Design a binder for this molecule. Structure first.
Ligand SMILES: [Ca+2]
Ligand SMILES: [Ca+2]
Ligand code: NA
Ligand code: NA
Lengths: 218, 217, 218
């Protein structure tokens, strides 16, 4: 991948369970009447979280579980692990299947990290969500449907660029991901009007590239 | 090769006959225990099962047991592997007996099994007939009760744990939502010895079914 | 690198932010009076923590943030991550710049892990801090200016060697780093007179090498 190239995310495995065991439902703390779950793993965590949020907009599902794996996909130690697992729950298998379809389609086509340099060794996520579903709005502590700038980069780049993004528009920090995340990245979620979120995304991206270009000159 | 047992290895072992009082306090050792035995190995859940086995074979308690980030494939030093365990006991003789029991068990008595041809997916489905004092405490069940110790990579584990719970009269007593430090998942199930064995068989079969077709849902 | 060789640490990236956004100042927990921060990443965490502490000595700065990355530098998944991020805060850019200069100088010249074998596959830190600054004194729960033995090694080596060090001199355990740290090491901080801390370091170093030579002879 060259500088500015999109890095495609991949779904590695998916399973639908029409009627989950009650011990499992208890451990996952599933909502009332949610007897079906859908599980997926993928090789890119933040793309997947955005995808799970998208699924809540497209189907009658809730995000029951979403966690990132230590060291990220480059350090995966089994074939189907990737760097993230997501679980959707819903009242029927048909709705969960629909939620999975939405999530898988999003992961593979709709959001991607971007390479910040020529040897594909620095990458960032700067994704503008026009209207949040139920998952990222809950995460951010904001009303469902608000806009979000989802900004992620490696540790130093993230901290520097997040500050630049906060200065670029009328936005507010609503979730802070101090590095390291499990994948050794950092960043945060910003909210504001859709256009302010987009301005923040653009500024974040430019800032990360600036650091990649000149890491030691301060 | 699929179905092959993946042997675990002990990397380092060291006995401390009389540990410093500051260390004793940090490890939470009983007043009566000033001998400890330390070991590292390249497989964490095999090691936890072994530490529990040691409590049945010697006058020892498990003082410490933690898994390392990324698992053994990502170890960044020679003797780290992916787990450290510490046994404590009233005398060096008893701790040595416990260490011997743990080392023998790790090297011979339990193993992950490969679920595919490339050895890139593996699972643990071990039936403990009679728990010692360590895994019983972890599971919140009486010492001596049986367990199915079921571990696999994240999606496989969640899917197969569900299948295992449906396969026999068993109950979930410890839930290991992925990722563990080694990026696996699973759980401990309890029930009669035969039920735990049935759960193990069903778990193993389900992990293999996912490995065979990961994207068919 | 051969047995006994010092393993030089490197600073990977540095940024100075003269007036950080107030949202981020809150998330980082800075004092109302500190809006300048200096961020750095490096490839060795314990050397960096020692450096950050040293940096508080000649400049008007506090260590605001210091975290290690999962798996250590050998498992880094991007170019500028290394295995640690540190943030200094202070009241003005001039003071933070001074703190950064001290930290960078220290990381690259004044402290290092040492190789314990000929493979360069086992290494330890046994650094005697003559006078702590405000960061590691606080970490250890001791007064600023007290001496420390900063002792780190891989998991089993560390536990065995820490015990030997505790027996080697009149020192007291003031911070216990039970393995794994995020980088899968272990160890602790010991305090006593400077001469006692130095004796503890020598003992710890010898003990780690002993284990490396005799890992299974127990
Ligand atoms: Ca729909
Ligand atoms: Ca690796
Ligand atoms: Na799409
Ligand atoms: Na589209």
């Amino acid at each position: 991948a060259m500088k500015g190239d999109r890095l495609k995310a991949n779904v590695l495995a998916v399973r639908l369970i029409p009627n989950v065991d009650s011990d499992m439902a208890k451990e996952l703390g599933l909502p009332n009447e949610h007897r079906s779950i859908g599980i997926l793993t993928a090789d890119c965590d933040d793309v997947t979280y955005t995808a799970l949020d998208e699924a809540t907009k497209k189907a009658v599902v809730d995000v029951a579980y979403g966690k990132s794996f230590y060291g990220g996909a480059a350090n995966a130690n089994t074939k189907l692990a990737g760097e993230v697992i997501g679980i959707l729950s819903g009242p029927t298998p048909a709705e969960v299947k629909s939620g999975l379809a939405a999530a898988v389609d999003f992961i593979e086509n709709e959001a991607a990290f971007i390479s910040a340099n020529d040897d594909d060794s620095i990458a960032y996520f700067a994704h503008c969500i026009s209207r949040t579903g139920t998952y990222l709005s809950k995460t951010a502590g904001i009303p469902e449907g608000e806009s979000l700038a989802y900004l992620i980069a490696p540790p130093l780049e993230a901290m520097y660029a997040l500050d630049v993004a906060l200065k670029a528009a009328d936005v507010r920090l609503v979730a802070f991901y101090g590095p390291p995340s499990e994948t050794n990245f950092g960043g945060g979620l910003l909210t504001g009007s859709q256009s302010a979120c987009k301005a923040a995304c653009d500024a974040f991206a430019e800032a990360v590239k600036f650091v990649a270009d000149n890491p030691l000159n301060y």
